[PDB]
């Protein structure tokens, strides 16, 4: 469970616009 909680945090990042824009900019370079 302790490890499963972490993957839930990532789950939100990718549906958080603000976290997204930092994901995409991370790929641009």
């Amino acid at each position, epitope marked *: 469970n302790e490890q499963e909680l972490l993957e839930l945090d990532k789950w939100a990042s990718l*549906w958080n616009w*603000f976290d*997204i824009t930092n994901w995409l*900019w991370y790929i641009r370079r």
Partner: antibody
């Protein structure tokens, strides 16, 4: 076909409080980002605050000269946007709009968190303040 | 305090004119453009690199270069006598938003 009707504005003494309402129809409200913009008398538009959507946890960000007195909230069950104001001052008087906030991010040349544009605008409700 | 604009710009009927927005955040973020006639709701004109909303005439064109944004009207009409506001992020990397002084477009009579 998109309709936004602001109300709940009027006259109040300084230090008072007020609650504005903004209906919504013609688009999916429950997920839309929403923004409050005000136009003082004779001056231009001034961004107040914006409430995000479910992917963002309904988080809100406020303008600097405003943060601390106002609070924005939303009732998606009925498609209503609310702006409570406290410790009102003379500066706060002006026309108040609610605007459907869209989002832009050019992948190749954009910079986080991107930009925000205001698709639709209501006629707005006039606030006035006087001692 | 963040974004600057011209206050009073003019042009004759059928000519061309451009009004510009300026700010250190425009080096990193695009800007939106809105028309505002007194007693009428603002209207979104242009946003991002190239996005004109439907129902807008094609004569409106935007452009970005350095720390400046710019709106352009080709062959200005009488109905374009109005006020124009740019809008972007108050700072590079902020979650907020801001407007400029605004610009009155006088269709010269």
């Amino acid at each position: 076909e998109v309709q936004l009707v602001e109300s709940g504005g009027g006259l109040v003494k300084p230090g008072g409080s007020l609650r504005l309402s903004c209906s919504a129809s013609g688009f999916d409200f429950d997920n839309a980002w929403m923004t409050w913009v005000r136009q003082p008398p004779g001056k231009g538009l001034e961004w107040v605050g914006r409430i995000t959507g479910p992917g963002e946890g309904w988080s809100v960000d406020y303008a600097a000269p405003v943060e601390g007195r106002f609070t924005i909230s939303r009732l998606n069950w009925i498609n209503f946007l609310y702006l409570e104001m406290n410790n009102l001052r003379m500066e706060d008087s002006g026309l108040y709009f609610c605007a459907r906030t869209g989002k832009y991010y050019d992948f190749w040349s954009g910079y986080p968190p991107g930009e925000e544009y205001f698709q639709d605008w209501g006629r707005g409700t006039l606030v006035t303040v006087s001692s | 305090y963040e974004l600057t604009q011209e206050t009073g710009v003019s042009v004759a009927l059928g000519r061309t004119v451009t009004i510009t927005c300026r700010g250190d955040s425009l080096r990193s973020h695009y800007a939106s453009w809105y028309q505002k006639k007194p007693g009428q709701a603002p209207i979104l004109l242009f946003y991002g690199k190239n996005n004109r909303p439907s129902g807008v005439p094609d004569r409106f064109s935007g452009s970005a270069s350095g720390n400046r944004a710019s709106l352009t009207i080709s062959g200005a009409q009488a109905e374009d006598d109005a006020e124009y506001y740019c809008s972007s992020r108050d700072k590079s990397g902020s979650r907020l938003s801001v407007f400029g002084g605004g610009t009155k477009l006088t269709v010269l009579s």
